[PDB]
Design a protein around this nucleic acid. Sequence first.
RNA 1: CCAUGUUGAUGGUAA
RNA 2: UUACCAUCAACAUGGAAACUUGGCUC
Length: 734
Amino acid sequence: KQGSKGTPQSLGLNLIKIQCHNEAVYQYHVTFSPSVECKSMRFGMLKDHQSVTGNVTAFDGSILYLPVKLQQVVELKSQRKTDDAEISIKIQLTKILEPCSDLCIPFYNVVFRRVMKLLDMKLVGRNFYDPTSAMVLQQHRLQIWPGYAASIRRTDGGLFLLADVSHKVIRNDSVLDVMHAIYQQNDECSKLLVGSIVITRYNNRTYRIDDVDWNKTPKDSFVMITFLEYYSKNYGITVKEDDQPLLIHREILLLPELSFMTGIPEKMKKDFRAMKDLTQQINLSPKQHHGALECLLQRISQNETASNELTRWGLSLHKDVHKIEGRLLPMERINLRNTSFVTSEDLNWVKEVTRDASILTIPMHFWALFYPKRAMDQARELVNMLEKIAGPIGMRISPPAWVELKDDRIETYIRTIQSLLGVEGKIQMVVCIIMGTRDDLYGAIKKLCCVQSPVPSQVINVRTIGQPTRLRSVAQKILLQMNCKLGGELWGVDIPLKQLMVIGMDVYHDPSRGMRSVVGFVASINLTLTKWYSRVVFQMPHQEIVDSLKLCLVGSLKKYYEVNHCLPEKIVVYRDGVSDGQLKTVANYEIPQLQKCFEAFDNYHPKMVVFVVQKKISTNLYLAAPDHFVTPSPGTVVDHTITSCEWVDFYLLAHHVRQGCGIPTHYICVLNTANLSPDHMQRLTFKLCHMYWNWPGTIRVPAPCKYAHKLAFLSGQILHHEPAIQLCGNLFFL
RNA sequence: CCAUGUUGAUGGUAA
RNA sequence: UUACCAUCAACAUGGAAACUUGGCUC
Ligand SMILES: [Mg+2]
Ligand SMILES: [Mg+2]
């Protein structure tokens, strides 16, 4: 699963290798011949007999892990404390596995978390925050303490430790001081305490709150003893205020003396500079990221106790972050009409698209402009600018048919558009100037123009056209989107292998509408991957959706035949929006059932190459500049020692990230019949990342997944209905 | 505490 | 909704926990 395509690059991850020394990890069944009901008693029963086993016993209740050999059958005996029965524990061997085998992970992680606890770090949520090494700005009584999450996972290269920083901000005024401010200003502002995360400094707990009561238990005594006495036992705390109100969480009661508010204070948020000063600390370059990681590692290295509880199991962290070599995929060549160019070092070619002509640019001779009374001049200016820039892009635009809206009410907009569309019957496009952040009007316009009557339509908000010195850019982008929405073609990229049909899918999960689960589907119907065919499937049950997907695939193939006179031999499906857990299921059942529709056509044997693309990953990559770390260049692929051990996949950094750590994307290949080399699939996915006709530049996922998400969003959020058939021959949804 | 979605604010980038 | 990118907030959907020499409410 390795290949050579470009110049190597000496990267570095936020990963720390764990060296397993022995080969002794032994699973054991535990059972009891008399019945013991209490889990705690089973733990104690193991505890008293630990001498024979050793002190490295890890026990969850039914299976035991031990790094030293025992006899196959081990029989020990003891007495119960409750029933006084002769409890006879039996322990038996299970199997023998390598110390890095993906099955002994979930208690190795417990070992590491204990090692952190020995280093005096709190356990908020799932992160470790170090209180002492904190920075106090004190501008609004604010101290930010840092922290870093750390988890041990297994990859093809072995046991690695993924560690990454996350900063948390705290004040130094207690909530009691704020309550005193509320009292003196004059419980008027106690209402803001709702939804406020509160903290205990020593951090034995974190909390959230809903309301506060004033006189329930200020001077009272808690259940067994005085309030102050129990808080003295817990924290050894003396309370300044005797009549402190009491906070209510759900019913649990919390206190204001030790309750410190968290997050950015609401008044700070308004402050621009302050918010800018805080973002300076929160946001980190690779240099400070690596510095914090090295601080963690040195902290563990210096304490002998952390090392001893580590090395009881034979493990040992290294002294430096993992260093990997990954290759830089070569640069692509983007095609235009009469001209073509190799992309720049930052992977962005906005100027080239606008200066030079596009591939196909059908003329515009009949179009209608709908604006309200309050936007006369700007609208007119816009039209002039839209004419002035038309020539370089390579379009012929005639003056629009002006329509003046008497008001902003949506009925007038809809009625006027419908009337003009009906009478003329040749309006190739509708342009609407919306007067404000009016969502209902946008939805109504798109519905009228995409289901009831088939005209492509573009909307231009008044704010965007309002600003001169930026009108040229907005005119350029609006006109390019208009050209795309009419079946035009902006730019293209060569494909080296012959006779492929790239398909993509992605899903829109409804937040509230009973899981409609609209799924996009974009499949090329041209040899140059330039003309796209798009459908939408409105099916809620996951079992039922595959039937409609089969219908979609056969229809797409039929149109491919009817427009090219020869079916393709290879199919590549960039499935998306699939969780890691569902991946196996998608590889087992959904893919073969989707494949089974190919029996509808005779003597047709394709070769599918199915991917799954998940954007969210937690590994970062740093380029090794000689004196610090910098941000990795776009177009870097790594498949060594960080990829998984059952699939064939790779991590790709495609887009241009301005500052900080870079986040690649993961390409699981869950079926491969065409026998493509890893180099070929890697380069092909990088080529497909360049073919998004809305943002001139490089994107994260391949273009078909981006298009399917856009179509699903439009059809499920805006239209709530399937679009018309005649529009689906073009990229109507941009 | 996690994901999945939206809705905003702020700051960039785009002749 | 000109189009992308970050950061922070909210909401609505589903889940999970820390125990490990066994976290732990006050
Ligand atoms: Mg997608
Ligand atoms: Mg658009």
